[PDB]
Amino acid sequence: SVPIPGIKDISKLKFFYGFKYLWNPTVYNKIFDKLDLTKTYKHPEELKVLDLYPGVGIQSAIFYNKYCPRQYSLLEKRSSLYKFLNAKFEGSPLQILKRDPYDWSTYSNLIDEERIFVPEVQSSDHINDKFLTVANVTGEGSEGLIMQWLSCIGNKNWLYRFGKVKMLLWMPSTTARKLLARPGMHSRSKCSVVREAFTDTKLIAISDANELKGFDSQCIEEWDPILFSAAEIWPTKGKPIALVEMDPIDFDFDVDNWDYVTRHLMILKRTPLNTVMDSLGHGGQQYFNSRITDKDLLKKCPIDLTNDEFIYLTKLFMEWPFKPDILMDFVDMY
Amino acid sequence: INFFEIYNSLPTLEEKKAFESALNIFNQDRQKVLENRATEAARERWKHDFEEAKARGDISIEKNLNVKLWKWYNEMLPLVKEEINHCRSLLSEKLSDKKGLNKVDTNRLGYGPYLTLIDPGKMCVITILELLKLNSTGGVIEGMRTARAVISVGKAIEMEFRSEQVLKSEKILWPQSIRARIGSVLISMLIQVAKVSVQGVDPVTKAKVHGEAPAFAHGYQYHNGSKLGVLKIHKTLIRQLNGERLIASVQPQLLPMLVEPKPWVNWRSGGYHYTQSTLLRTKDSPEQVAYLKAASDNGDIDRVYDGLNVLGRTPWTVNRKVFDVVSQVWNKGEGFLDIPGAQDEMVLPPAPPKNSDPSILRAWKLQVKTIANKFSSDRSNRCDTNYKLEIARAFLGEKLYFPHNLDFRGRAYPLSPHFNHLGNDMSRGLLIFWHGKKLGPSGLKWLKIHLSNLFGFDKLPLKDRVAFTESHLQDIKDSAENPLTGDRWWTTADKPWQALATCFELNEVMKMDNPEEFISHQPVHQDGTCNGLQHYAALGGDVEGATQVNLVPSDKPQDVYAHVARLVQKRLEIAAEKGDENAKILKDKITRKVVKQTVMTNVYGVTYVGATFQIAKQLSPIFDDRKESLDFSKYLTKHVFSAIRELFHSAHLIQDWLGESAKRISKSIRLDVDEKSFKNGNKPDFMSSVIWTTPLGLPIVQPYREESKKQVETNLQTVFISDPFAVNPVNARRQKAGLPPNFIHSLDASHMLLSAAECGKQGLDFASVHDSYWTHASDIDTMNVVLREQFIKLHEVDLVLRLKEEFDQRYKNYVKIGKLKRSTDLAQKIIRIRKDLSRKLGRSTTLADEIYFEKKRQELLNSPLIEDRNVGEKMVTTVSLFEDITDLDALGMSVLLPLRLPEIPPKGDFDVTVLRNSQYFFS
RNA sequence: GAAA
DNA sequence: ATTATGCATTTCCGACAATATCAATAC
DNA sequence: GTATTGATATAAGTAAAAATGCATAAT
């Protein structure tokens, strides 16, 4: 009952700002079946969904035709994309707003100021049953926005004050590889540590078979991602894209100290711990040598460590009496 | 034993000369003590403090800095000794390769011989002093940068060896890699040794915990997704280093002299008696040093010597009254005038809840960063004032001298960097002349005009200025009687300390009945208005420029900045017809300060963002808008650029000619130098920099090049540094953007030096701040005459034409690059010759081969044998056929062109002599 | 901070 | 062949301005 | 095997893209 934009229509658009979009209804059906959101959300007719950077809107139209949610909203401020969305989706229950998803004040002015989109707050013992958010951040310069949203998962402030809001995001292949790297892998970084600490992420689909070697073979076997060619994404000059599902989880550490410890430890990501604690302050090496009795810990590199080991280290850092000030970690540039 | 009071008390000229001779004989040992070097002075001071502490029982915290430094030196010297022994053992054999650890010994084989030359205690003290000097530098909150510290320590060790070698002389340079390795090795050894004692509180016990912690630690930080190796200093050391014993801990090495400076007779002789200083300040350039040595050999720089000697021969002393007022203000503790105010530690607003708005969290982080930056800036600005006041205390009531140097352009600066008369208003008000000359019949008028100028009313006629000064007599009296605990009228001036000194002198004059016979020491300033624009007008013969920069005599002094501000306000009134709100907000908000900076900088080649920042910096205090006023500043820049483009024409013409000449020089290749193969293809190296000479014979070489930043493996880390000891292609944009300002500044410096030399010949006391010249109040008329005559003599010739002739002579045989389409018959001939010459050579002849053939053909005509010359003329090369053509500049393949410079713009017929009576040329 |  | 594209007036005072890890090559 | 120059990632609001300040060079 909702029109689905076609390849000829979406091909008339001039600028996509580096964002690749998908237009194949068959692979949309495949990925929706793989996700199996019908069981997670017991009342799809009572489901409120927020869409960020929709672009073509084909995914939103197929989502509506498949589930019939209680409310769906598209946030798109780019000129031609919004114009095409209004032209193709007017006269339908889908709603399009001329707002830019990057601004932090946009969500406040949309939720508690203008009183348009209000999610349902529930307990943290289960995934948010009446709130779903969908995003498409494929622009290669917009990885900072993804990391900011992960930090917002950590702080429970941006959209996670509502609960365990399930995330569905299209990201570039490199970003997914970096976020889904296991201990010991060459691509593991602080983004991987944040992903392991805050979320539970799965690779629902990818756009290139040759890029799967960046992921762990065991994780690939468990996930069973859906693969499709690059001919199904309209702007064909871009790198392959991937789809992930992020489920926020519970944690029992302090975010500021953990962030400081991980950031200053993973700078030297191939150096054993018996020579990197000197970078955490004055006397750090002797203090941590005295306070740590484990054997392989003093020889493991921080790329070999995991979230539990990092939490142990940050708890020791808290217990340090002579610890440095976390706040005074910046430069006097401007 | 005060000497200035005795000198003033002596009533006879012969007795004054006798006392001056006695003082000069007596001050030699004091000069030797002052010029005693840093390593020896620091070592003796630290050992003395340690001995005194050992004598007085056990007192640690009182002299903690010096006691700790001596302890560290004593317990860290053996590490350096053992490393030197290890290096000797690993170099004495000199037999095996791939010996030891790959990272360890291959580095030692590199930095070994550079460590065995200098004394181990000497490197110890050098490292300690450098690391104490470079604190809170580079944006690091409480420490230095590793890249900075390794170079500074290594460079200091290199410099101390040069002094030791030359001292024994009564080896060229060290590589940057070696400097970095030495610095890293020694800083690591100091880190391993430096221990401080601090007490903290246990989080779970809430009681004090005792222990010893390293003083220095090596860590990394981030700024916009990029690493930053840093070195930190513990708070227990910061609190003492930023204290009032910093002068005792780090003794200065370039202080004002007590005896008359050694005259300049050679490019490496002059200034201090025991310290060797080069005439020029060459940051990193061997070409400038080579050209300076060649000029010194030729002997074409002697007026430069005369001017610098006149500048350095003037005696100074410390103003006791202003010093006492400054000391009272400083000891009070409250922030007064521009002294910020002594605060101990930071104050931070309470953090919001963690689950608050991300915008709120970002705002809080921004506020914290701003507060920390302000606190650090205030602490630095207070430490600088403390250092200057301690030097003033040291040299109180004593004769002073300030030997001068030059920078690569030619402008003159004192050798002493800490306390001199180029500082801020406090430093300029803390210094007076040693010789006190009678005021005569004009000193009163000139001193009153000086005070009126120091109150910012330096755009009024002289009658108005003296009327202002004589109307404010009661305020002058009150300010000079009780500066503090009074009406504080002198603080309203834009130069408060100088106004205070002038008020002291004026009251001391007014207390008598015969002001003519008063003895004054206060220097009086006379500076030109829009000096760069004046020089541009003189260069271009611009009658309009001359009449608007006060060159043409007039009753009232003009102000180009006020004129431009008024014109732009009229333009905004015009735009009020459209009445856009952005224009309406700033229509009447124009200020002559903003217009002044923009108009001054425009003739030097300023860009849109530069003008935007210049306008915004001075528009912030007006607070017309938020920090997003950059839109308002950009509109301001647009219309002020339109106005200045309308106004200034001949100056921009000369600027364009200079820029075009710089481009032609930067895109040129030498014949003999670049005849060798480069194996880069059709892209020959550009090794030519814009060089010219001042009318005084000083050669100026532009040092702009391209910097290659590569990581160097040091002990602490791998620093990201460049090599300024290697030849690199010249930065064309830098040369083109630097020539127009450098030429004008060189002209300014030459005129200042001419005036200084003539005033020295005429027996006056001369001091200068670039475009501003100081002297006694009674010698101002003679000084004005000297300046006018020197300016007329300097600009009597066509300086731009002489520069063009010099460029043509120095670039006789040079090759440019040009692309012309083969559609033209002439341009296709070059392509045919290139094909024909390739077949003749038997291979694919390149641009390098063609240039080499042209250079070799020229050598034939330059050969003494006519037969070779006849063959050379008979032989036609690629560039030879293009010598006659001078119109193909605008008429595809790249072809070689000769170096021809643009024609000089027409110069208006303006007689520069007419300024010999212009009252407001300098004021 | 100082000068164009 | 117009598209990207680095840079934004000069000088001096300590007056600045990234480092680690890896991935094929070269020897 | 050891040794070497180049490519790539880091953090994460003072966006990136598109549309400009602007000249110079380029993929």
Ligand SMILES: *O[C@H]1[C@@H](O)[C@H](n2cnc3c(=O)[nH]c(N)nc32)O[C@@H]1COP(=O)(O)OP(=O)(O)OP(=O)(O)O
């Ligand atoms: O007022 C200045 C000054 O006290 C100090 N400061 C900043 N840079 C320097 C410097 O190179 N040398 C010295 N001796 N002192 C310095 O910090 C204060 C803050 O200066 P701002 O950043 O506000 O202004 P800046 O000098 O950068 O202005 P400009 O020269 O770019 O116009």
